[PDB]
Symmetry: C3
Subunit: 258 residues, 3 copies
Amino acid sequence: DLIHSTAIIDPSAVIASDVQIGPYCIIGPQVTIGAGTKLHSHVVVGGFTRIGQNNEIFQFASVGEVCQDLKYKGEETWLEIGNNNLIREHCSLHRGTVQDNALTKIGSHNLLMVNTHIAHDCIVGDHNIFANNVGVAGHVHIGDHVIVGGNSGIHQFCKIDSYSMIGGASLILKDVPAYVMASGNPAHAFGINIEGMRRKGWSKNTIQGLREAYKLIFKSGLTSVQAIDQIKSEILPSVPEAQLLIDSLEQSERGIVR
Amino acid sequence: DLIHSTAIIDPSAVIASDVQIGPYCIIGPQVTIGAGTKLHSHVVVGGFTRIGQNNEIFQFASVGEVCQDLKYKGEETWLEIGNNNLIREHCSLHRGTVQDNALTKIGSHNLLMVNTHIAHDCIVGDHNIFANNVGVAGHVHIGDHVIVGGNSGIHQFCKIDSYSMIGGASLILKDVPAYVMASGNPAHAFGINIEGMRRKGWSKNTIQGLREAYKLIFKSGLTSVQAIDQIKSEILPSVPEAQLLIDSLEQSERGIVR
Amino acid sequence: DLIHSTAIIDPSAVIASDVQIGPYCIIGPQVTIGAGTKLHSHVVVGGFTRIGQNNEIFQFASVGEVCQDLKYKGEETWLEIGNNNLIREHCSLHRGTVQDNALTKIGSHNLLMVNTHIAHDCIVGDHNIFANNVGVAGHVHIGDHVIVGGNSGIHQFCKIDSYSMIGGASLILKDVPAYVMASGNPAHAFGINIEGMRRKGWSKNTIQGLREAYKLIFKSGLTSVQAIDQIKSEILPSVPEAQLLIDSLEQSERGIVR
């Protein structure tokens, strides 16, 4: 049978068609599991979690457990997971806090390798890869097509925007703008994800515009606002892809990694 | 029922009033669990462990398992945990070795975030916070009100004294004195926990004394013993809080982080 | 009984004499477990795994699970584990990929401390120690008598040769030759494992030869091939132990750590 008899499923849970749940899983209250999702053995879904379609969750993952924030006082909060994600062994995904929006959210087509931690109130987009032992702290926002190298940590409230790459064993304390390669402890920007955007099939002119934008942001001594003005003036009109960089700088709360 | 029927509890275990134990927990021999403690599902308490009152232990924690020291030869040794601790998913807490005192000990009101490791023979005090993926190696002594940032490691035999703060992703190879902020890989002292002690409600004169003590220890070129003499002479009489710094330097075995 | 009634064992598994399997273990298809091996509670052996004799595997280890490589397309691949290994809590050992040789292999007498990850297609020899939270990425080859310090990461395709030592919290991006001490993030060579080879009972003349070889490789400005020529000419004839260093340099694919 698709659901092993030793799984324990709260009466308030709702399980869609063709869901697989292996031995010794625990499904808590107010959990919904979408069609085609597979849980291996030994998965705990704590409660208050909506899981989409065609996910796969491996043994010893702790999914939708209460957060670690000492401010938390038992309020009703949630975790949402989209579709087609891979959540490997030993991951921990925590529910939100009322101080933010009571919601931790992950999108679709993500790979969370062994021991990925997604803290309370994170918002993660689509097509991301978190390598082993990645720790994403509270209220972090991750875009799409991001790669986070193994054993890296992302500090609370940071924003890691689309197509960026974080090198292995990095400590990220500030925002990483769209397309940026950042690495280290301490953690510096090193350039644009040129190979990544070439592999995505982007033109030389587009790439050159983003390289000029990078120089304006990181090498020229300009403030974020000043760099935005230059990108808007000279680069954005022929390189619409530069808008993601502008968005990074406009949306930043912690400042950016340099 | 407060104890799930699928828990397996050794006949020599002793369980106090109002203890909760979730599905698929294993409670080994010579375990005592104090009143009000809650184990979620999938907790293993290996054996020879005394747990106090009002603790909470989450799924996939390995509590009171035999240590990893290759010198260990099956001797009877113990783990003790005090009261009101939070032990999150994937933690590992190991029993002691006869070469020391056959005891790993943690106090009360601690938060051990996901994947905290407490090795054999550690002694940990009260009100500490270990962020995700912290590794505390053998025979480490941690005081009270310490914060250890995520993905940090503390080398065997080190002493991390009260009110200190270890930055994220640090490698601590020597002692961290009371009140000291230390971070990095390699891991340096950077100052006194001023904000921490201000938030604890300490006076400016007290703070200034500790800053002078810091300068004597770290900036003056004096040895630990020489710095102690200066702190005793000039600072300790009006700043009794400086005694914790003196204790750090007097008790050090590995020397101190600089 | 040696096998707990709550273990779930695939009909195609083969279990040798005196095997112990604790509560709530899952043994998947095409698993073989050799004589004297002990699994604690809560071990998952995913499938397609051969385990030798006298191993010990602790709770929440994920052993012989499908790999994390996005290229993997459901092909039949394997994990092999030799004899007398210690696999601690929260380890993850993954099966191979057809792009290599469809096999992850670990030898004998290894200690894998808590949360050791061995990725697809790794080949690990004998008598190695992986400290807590070590991540070994895909296709890595580890020799014998290696020590990997806690919270270190080894990049895909690297080769870590016999008697080498990796310091705690290192990021290894290139090969570490035989006898070499390497540490850091970024990760440099710092010398020969002198104490290690003294403790193995090696002569002063042997040690001096290896130190000269180290200088040729790391300090002289010579290429790997040029250093090999010098070691062959002047050192190898009286110091046969230098052959392991030559092998490291000849076998390197990623180049070596400096």
